Design a protein around this ligand. Structure first.
Ligand SMILES: N[C@@H](Cc1cc(I)c(Oc2cc(I)c(O)c(I)c2)c(I)c1)C(=O)O
Length: 337
C-alpha cells in the first residue's frame, strides 16, 4: 500500500547508509527499486527460511504483511511503474537467463512472465564468455544504451542469472535555459578543494524548505509528469547528521513542510555512475540461507538445484537543462547448490 512505500524507502536509506560505510566521502548512486525488485523476484521461488530472510532483509515484517501480500504488492508496484505515462519514459523489467540443463518449475516461469514483467531466455552457460556478452547487451538495450558492461566477471559454474533493469527519462516541469548556464562554476568537493562544473541557473517558484532540526535545505524539482527530484543540501559539515536522519518519517515530515515560493536556483549539469558488488553486503544484511548448501529454492526448480553466489548493481545519472536520464540494473548469479 503506502505501507509498502514506507518500507521500501527505509530499505533504500539503510542500504544507502551501508554504502556510506563501504565507500565513505564518495559519490553514491543506485536504484533501490531495482535492487528490491530483483530480490523479491528471487524470493518468489524460495521457501521457508530462505524466503523469509530475503523479505525481512527488504524491511518487511511477516506478521504485519504476510508473504502473499508482499508478493502481490510488488507485482502491483512494477505494473504501476510501467503503466504508460505521457511525457515520461519509465520502464522496469526483469530477465531470467536459465541454464540449458536446469529444470525450472513451469509454475515459477509462468508466474514471473505473467505477473512480474519477465522475459525468460534459455542460456548456454558452457560458453560463459558468450553468455556474459548476451546478458550485458540485453541490459544495455533495455536501458537505452545507458548501462554498459553490467557483468564484469561471470563464474564458470553459473547456471542461472536473474537481471532487473530500470530506465528513466523525463523533462523538468521548468527546464533551464542553457543560455543562462555558467560554463565553469565552482563545486566544493571537500573543505579545501573545488571542481569546475557547468552551473544551470533559473529563478522560479519551487517547493522548498529549510529543515530547522537537520539544518539542511530541501528543494523539490518536478518533472513534467508523475515524477520529481528532491535535492537535499546540508549545511557545511552536516552531511553525516543528515544521512543518519534519512528515513520514511523524514520524507513524510518534508512532504507536509515543503512550501512553493520564488527561488534563485543554481543546479549543476553533470553525469555520474556507480557500481556495487552486493554479495557480501546482502549476506551481512541478513540474506544467509540463499548462499548456503542448504538453500531452499524449491519453488524455482524441480530438484532445488541452485544457490545464490554473486550479486551486483550498476546505476548511471545525467542531469542537464532539459531534464534527467537515469538507468540501473541488478543481477543475481546462481551456481549448483
Ligand atoms: N507533496 C508532493 C511532492 C512530493 C511527492 C513525493 I512521492 C514525496 O515523497 C514521499 C515519499 C514517501 I515513502 C512518503 O510517504 C511521502 I507522504 C512522500 C515528497 I517528500 C514530495 C506530492 O505529494 O506529490
Amino acid at each position: 500500500l503506502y505501507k509498502m512505500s514506507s518500507i521500501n524507502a527505509d530499505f533504500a536509506f539503510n542500504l544507502y547508509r551501508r554504502f556510506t560505510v563501504e565507500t565513505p566521502d564518495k559519490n553514491i548512486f543506485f536504484s533501490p527499486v531495482s535492487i528490491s525488485a530483483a530480490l523479491v523476484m528471487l524470493s518468489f521461488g524460495a521457501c521457508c527460511s530462505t524466503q523469509t530472510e530475503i523479505v525481512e532483509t527488504l524491511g518487511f515484517n511477516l506478521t504485519d504483511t504476510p508473504m502473499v501480500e508482499i508478493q502481490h504488492g510488488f507485482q502491483h508496484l512494477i505494473c504501476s511503474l510501467n503503466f504508460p505515462k505521457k511525457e515520461l519514459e519509465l520502464q522496469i523489467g526483469n530477465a531470467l537467463f536459465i541454464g540449458k540443463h536446469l529444470k525450472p518449475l513451469a509454475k515459477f516461469l509462468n508466474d514471473v512472465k505473467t505477473l512480474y514483467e519477465t522475459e525468460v531466455f534459455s542460456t548456454d552457460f558452457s560458453n560463459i564468455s558468450a553468455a556474459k556478452q548476451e546478458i550485458n547487451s540485453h541490459v544495455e538495450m533495455q536501458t537505452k544504451g545507458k548501462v554498459v558492461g553490467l557483468i564484469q566477471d561471470l563464474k564458470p559454474n553459473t547456471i542461472m542469472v536473474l537481471v532487473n533493469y530500470i530506465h528513466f527519462k523525463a523533462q523538468w516541469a521548468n527546464p533551464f535555459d542553457p543560455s543562462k548556464t555558467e560554463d565553469s562554476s565552482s563545486f566544493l568537493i571537500d573543505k579545501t578543494t573545488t571542481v569546475q562544473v557547468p552551473m544551470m541557473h533559473q529563478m522560479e517558484q519551487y517547493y522548498h524548505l529549510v529543515d530547522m532540526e537537520l539544518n539542511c535545505t530541501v528543494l523539490q524539482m518536478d518533472y513534467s509528469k508523475n515524477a520529481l527530484a528532491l535535492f537535499v543540501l546540508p549545511k557545511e559539515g552536516q552531511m553525516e547528521s543528515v544521512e543518519a536522519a534519512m528515513s520514511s518519517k523524514t520524507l513524510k515530515k518534508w512532504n507536509r513542510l515543503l512550501q512553493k515560493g520564488w527561488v534563485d536556483l543554481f543546479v549543476p549539469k553533470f553525469s555520474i555512475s556507480a557500481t556495487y558488488d552486493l554479495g557480501a553486503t546482502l549476506l551481512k544484511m541478513g540474506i544467509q540461507h540463499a548462499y548456503s548448501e542448504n538453500a531452499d529454492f524449491s519453488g524455482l526448480t524441480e530438484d532445488n538445484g541452485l544457490k545464490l553466489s554473486n550479486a551486483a548493481h550498476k546505476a548511471v545519472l545525467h542531469i542537464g537543462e532539459k531534464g534527467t536520464e537515469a538507468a540501473g540494473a541488478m543481477f543475481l548469479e546462481a551456481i549448483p547448490r
